[PDB]
Amino acid sequence: SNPLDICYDVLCENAYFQKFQLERVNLQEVKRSTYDHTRKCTDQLLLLGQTDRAVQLLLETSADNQHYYCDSLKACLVTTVTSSGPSQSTIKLVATNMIANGKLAEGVQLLCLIDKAADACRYLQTYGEWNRAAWLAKVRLNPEECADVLRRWVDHLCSPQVNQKSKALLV
Amino acid sequence: ICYDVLCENAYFQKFQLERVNLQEVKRSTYDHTRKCTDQLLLLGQTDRAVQLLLETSADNQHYYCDSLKACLVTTVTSSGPSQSTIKLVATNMIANGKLAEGVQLLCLIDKAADACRYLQTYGEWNRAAWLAKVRLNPEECADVLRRWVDHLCSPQVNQKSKALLV
Numbered sequence: 001s002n003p004l005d006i007c008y009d010v011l012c013e014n015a016y017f018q019k020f021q022l023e024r025v026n027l028q029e030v031k032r033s034t035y036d037h038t039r040k041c042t043d044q045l046l047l048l049g050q051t052d053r054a055v056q057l058l059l060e061t062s063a064d065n066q067h068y069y070c071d072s073l074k075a076c077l078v079t080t081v082t083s084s085g086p087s088q089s090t091i092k093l094v095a096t097n098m099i100a101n102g103k104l105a106e107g108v109q110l111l112c113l114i115d116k117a118a119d120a121c122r123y124l125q126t127y128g129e130w131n132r133a134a135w136l137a138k139v140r141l142n143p144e145e146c147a148d149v150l151r152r153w154v155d156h157l158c159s160p161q162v163n164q165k166s167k168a169l170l171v
Numbered sequence: 172i173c174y175d176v177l178c179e180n181a182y183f184q185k186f187q188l189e190r191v192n193l194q195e196v197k198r199s200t201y202d203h204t205r206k207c208t209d210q211l212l213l214l215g216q217t218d219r220a221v222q223l224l225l226e227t228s229a230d231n232q233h234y235y236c237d238s239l240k241a242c243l244v245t246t247v248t249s250s251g252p253s254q255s256t257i258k259l260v261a262t263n264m265i266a267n268g269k270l271a272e273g274v275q276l277l278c279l280i281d282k283a284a285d286a287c288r289y290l291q292t293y294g295e296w297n298r299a300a301w302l303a304k305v306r307l308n309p310e311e312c313a314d315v316l317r318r319w320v321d322h323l324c325s326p327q328v329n330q331k332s333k334a335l336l337v
Contacts, residue, residue, distance in 0.1 A: 059260070063267045072264065073239050076257055080247050091242050094225075098238065101229045 010134055011170055017138050021048060029057075035065070043105075046078070047112050048139060055079055084115040092116075099123055112136065118145050125149070130156060176300055177336055180312075183304050187214065195223075201231070209271075213278055214305065217244055250281040258282065265289055283307050287315050296322060 003016045010017075025048055029041050038057065045054040058075035061068045081091070091114055099107035104127060111120040117140040124133035134153055137146040150171055157168040172178065172186060191214060195207050204223065211220040224241035227234045247257070257280055265273035270293055277286035283306040290299035296319055303315040316337055323334040 055256075069272070070236055070239070072260055073236065073243060076260055077239060077243050077246070079256055080243070080253055082253070083246075087246055090221075090245055094238055094242055103235075106235070 008170075010138060014138065014143065021139060025050075043109065046109055047136065051078065051082075078113065081114060088114060104129075108136075112140065117141050118149070121149050125152060125156075174336075176304060180304060180309065187301075187305060191216075201227075209275065212244065213275055213302075217248065217279075221245055244279065247280060254280060258285075270295075278302065278306070284311050284315070291315070291318060291322075 004012045006012060006016070006020055025041070025044050028037075028044065032038050032041055038060070042054055042057055045057070055075050055078055058071050058078070061071045091110070095107045095110045095114075098110070104123070108120040108124055111117070111123075117136060121133045121137050121141075124130075124136065130153055133149065137149040141149075154168040154171050156162070157164045157171075172182075191207070191210050194210070198204050198207060204226075208220055208223050211217075211223065221241050221244055224237055224244070227237045247254075258277070261273045261276045261280075264276075270289070274286040274290060277283075277289070283302060287299045287303050287307075290296075290302065299315065300319055303312040307315075320334045320337050322328065323330045323337070
C-alpha cells in the first residue's frame with residue numbers, strides 16, 4: 001500500500017492513523033492501575049468507536065464508590081441507545097444543554113456516541129480545542145465531512161496571531 | 172375508599188392518580204420534587220415525568236445523574252432483546268443493598284411482578300401490595316395477594332381478619 005510514515009501524524013491516511021490509535025488504546029488498557037485510569041480509558045474507548053469492550057469495563061465499579069450509580073446508568077444507556085433513527089431529538093437537546101452549561105467533554109462524548117461527530121467537532125473548534133477536534137475528525141467521519149473541518153482548521157492556522165503557515169500548507 | 176385493598180383496581184388507580192396530582196401541585200423543595208418524580212415513574216406516567224426530570228438547576232450535584240436518567244426513561248420504553256443486561260444490572264443493584272432504586276427500574280422496564288416478589292422477599296409487604304394493586308392484570312396479582320395472605324396467617328402476625336377480607 002506504501003503508506004506515509006507515522007512521523008507526520010495528521011498528514012497520514014485514515015485507516016493507518018486509526019490502526020495506530022487502536023494499538024495505543026490497547027496499550028493503555030493493558031496497564032491500567034487505579035480508578036483514575038480506568039475512567040480515562042473508558043472515555044477514550046467511547047470515542048474510538050469500541051462499544052462492546054467499553055460496557056464490560058464499565059460494569060466493574062466497586063459497590064462502595066460514589067460513582068457506581070452513574071457508571072451503571074451510563075453502561076445501560078450505551079447498551080440501549082444503539083438505535084440512531086428515532087428518539088434522538090431529546091438526546092441532542094440534552095447534549096447541547098450540557099455543552100452550554102460548561103461540561104464540554106461529556107457533551108462531545110455523548111454526541112459522538114449517538115450518531116454525530118461533525119457537530120461535536122464544530123463545538124470543539126468553537127471553544128478553541130483545535131487539536132482534539134482534528135484528531136476526532138481524523139479518527140471518525142467520512143473523508144467528505146472531514147474536509148470542511150480541516151479547511152476550517154487551516155483557515156484558523158493562517159491567522160496573524162498564530163503564524164503557522166507551514167502546517168496549513170501541509171494539511 | 173374506606174377499604175384500602177378491598178376495592179376495585181380502576182378505582183384505586185384513579186384515587187392514587189388524584190393523590191399524586193395533588194402532591195405534584197404543591198412542590199416546594201427539591202427533595203419533594205424527587206419524591207414526586209419517583210412516584211410518577213413508579214405509577215407509569217413517564218410523559219409527565221420526563222419534563223419534571225429536565226428541570227434540575229445547573230448548580231446541583233445531581234444534575235448529571237438526573238439528565239442521564241431522563242434520556243434513559245425515554246429510550247427504553249420498548250421491551251426487545253436488549254433487556255436481559257438491564258435486568259441483570261437491576262438485580263445486582265438490589266442485591267448490593269439498594270432496593271428502591273432497583274425496584275423502580277424493574278417496574279419501569281417491563282417487570283412489575285419481579286419487583287413485587289423482591290419487595291415481598293425483603294419485608295415490604297404494604298408497598299408490594301400497593302404495586303400489585305396499581306399495575307398488573309387481574310391474573311398475576313392474585314398470586315401476590317395469596318402470598319401476602321399466607322404471611323398474614325402466620326402465628327406471629329395474627330391478622331387473620333385482614334387475610335379473610337383479602
